[PDB]
């Protein structure tokens, strides 16, 4: 797990990593992985979260302060943020 | 331009395609391409848009109805939505 950019509590960052880790064990398709993480964060930290998972992408988004993380789990990038 | 999924007026779809076309002519890096599109849409259709541009990614997001498009321009996939 390599954190590239975060505006998020250390605690919530850990939760994002654990959540992504669980998703990658259950699923191998990016859409399913993203859905797992998005749904779990909506449930635990209220809507509205968005999640992008992939090896090759760029993004430009707007997020609430303290609710943004961009990290790698191995070679796969994960963007998770709340609008 | 191949629309893979959309919930958007035909006129706004054409604007997304045109805007993405302009972004690709100008910018080489996905993040910059995404930023151009996102910014044009905030300006023209009000905040808050988010844009992902890439060749390998999956997503799960929440969008306002009538404000979601997912399409390819050549070999590049573009996800653009308002939340």
């Amino acid at each position: 797990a390599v954190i590239k950019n975060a505006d998020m509590s250390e605690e919530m960052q850990q939760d994002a990593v654990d959540c992504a880790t669980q998703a990658l064990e259950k699923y191998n398709i990016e859409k399913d992985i993203a859905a797992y993480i998005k749904k779990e964060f909506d449930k635990k930290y209220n809507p509205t979260w968005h999640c992008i998972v992939g090896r090759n992408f760029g993004s430009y988004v707007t997020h609430e302060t303290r609710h943004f993380i961009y990290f790698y789990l191995g070679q796969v990038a994960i963007l998770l943020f709340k609008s | 331009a191949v629309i893979k999924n959309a919930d958007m007026s035909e006129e706004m779809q054409q604007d997304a395609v045109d805007c993405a076309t302009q972004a690709l002519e100008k910018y080489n890096i996905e993040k910059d391409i995404a930023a151009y599109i996102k910014k044009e849409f905030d300006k023209k259709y009000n905040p808050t848009w988010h844009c992902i541009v890439g060749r390998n990614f999956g997503s799960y997001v929440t969008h306002e109805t009538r404000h979601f498009i997912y399409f390819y321009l050549g070999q590049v996939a573009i996800l653009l939505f308002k939340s």
Partner: peptide
């Protein structure tokens, strides 16, 4: 408060 942020895979 909201912030714009960009990301790019390597």
């Amino acid at each position: 408060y909201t912030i714009c942020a960009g990301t790019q895979t390597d």
